[PDB]
Amino acid sequence: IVGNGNVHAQVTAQLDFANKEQTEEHYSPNGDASKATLRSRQLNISEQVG
């Protein structure tokens, strides 16, 4: 569109030459009883009405 020679451009690049290593651990929240997965549950209930 502009024509040969009717355009000039120059590019400079800031690069990344730093070696990085990352380990990510994520736990799904289980505070709601509906999405909570259980292995063992002990429920002792006592009601001594006088």
Binding site: R39, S40, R41, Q42, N44
Partner: protein, 123 residues
């Protein structure tokens, strides 16, 4: 464990004797309370019941292990008091002495069994 099965009967008898001893001493202590009923346990039936559970499963280290947590029969009154107290001194004094004697006998038998199991091993 097999060691528990051998000593289960005497341990349960000793514990039941201690519990009934506490109940009899409570009957003695509350002799003067008006309206107090003298309570007791049937030793043989409760010993059957104890002689005749599911630890919750621990998947890892953080998982918390399961946390752990008798029937009293009224004594038939002999003399009618006016304040409603049915505790009789003589009957429960004899029962108290008998329970003390049987607790000592159970201690003797359990100690003899443990001492025999020990001299089998010593050498």
């Amino acid at each position: 464990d097999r060691l528990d099965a051998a000593l289960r009967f005497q341990q349960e008898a000793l514990n039941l004797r201690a519990q009934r001893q506490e109940i009899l001493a409570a009957n003695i202590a509350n002799a003067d309370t008006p309206g107090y009923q003298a309570r007791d346990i049937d030793f043989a039936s409760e010993l059957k019941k104890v002689m005749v559970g599911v630890a919750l499963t621990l998947t890892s280290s953080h998982h918390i292990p399961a946390q752990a947590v008798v029937d009293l029969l009224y004594r038939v009154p002999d003399q009618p008091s006016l304040d409603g107290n049915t505790v009789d001194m003589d009957r429960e004094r004899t029962q108290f002495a008998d329970n003390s004697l049987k607790y000592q006998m159970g201690l003797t038998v359990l100690g003899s069994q443990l001492k025999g199991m020990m001299n089998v091993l010593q050498g």
